Design a protein around this ligand. Structure first.
Ligand SMILES: *C(=O)CCCCCCCCCCCCC
Lengths: 164, 5
């Protein structure tokens, strides 16, 4: 299995998945995801319920955000989970906008768990914001999930800031 | 990525 240091050195979003669904040997399942602007409290996206790809359709105002709060709920299968860690790398074209390295902590088996994380946005020039709005899906992320420094899940996303 | 179901 891939270690955090291997993906922390990646300069580009991966072409393909770095692991298989069967690599999720803890049966971690994401059951709710919510993000909110911590400036206004406005909920920006909420969802509750293969499935390793999400396409986000946001508005230009999204790229004026500074601080966004994420709440994640997940269930865990019958094994204990220690040092649950997500490295999420946001790219525009072929370069890193920002790396996020979040601690999801310890989980007991068959448990339902909630975590709160804060995304502080990178500083974006006006030219980069316009490029991102006018190049939908050129902004892309890899979310790499590690338990005890072993890669168990890889989720992908892309982003448009094009919406009405 | 946590938005994936
Ligand atoms: C997986 O579903 C990814 C969820 C993305 C969270 C919302 C976006 C976080 C903001 C990061 C800023 C990146 C550069 C504009």
């Amino acid at each position: 299995t891939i270690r955090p240091e291997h993906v922390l050195r990646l300069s580009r979003v991966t072409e393909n998945y770095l692991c298989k669904p069967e690599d999720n040997i803890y049966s971690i399942d994401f059951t709710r995801f919510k993000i909110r602007d911590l400036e206004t409290g406005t909920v920006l996206f909420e969802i509750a319920k293969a499935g390793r790809f999400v396409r986000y359709q946001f508005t230009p105002a999204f790229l004026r955000l500074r601080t966004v709060g994420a709440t994640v709920e997940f269930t865990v299968g019958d094994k204990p989970v220690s040092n649950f860690r997500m490295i999420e790398r946001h790219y525009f074209r072929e370069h890193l906008l920002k790396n996020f390295d979040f601690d999801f902590g310890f989980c007991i088996p068959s448990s339902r768990n909630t975590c709160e994380h804060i995304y502080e946005f990178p500083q974006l020039s006006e030219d980069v914001i316009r490029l991102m709005i006018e190049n939908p899906y050129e902004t892309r992320s890899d979310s790499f999930y590690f338990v005890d420094n072993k890669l168990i899940m890889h989720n992908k996303a892309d982003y448009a800031y094009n919406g009405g | 990525g946590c938005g994936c179901s």
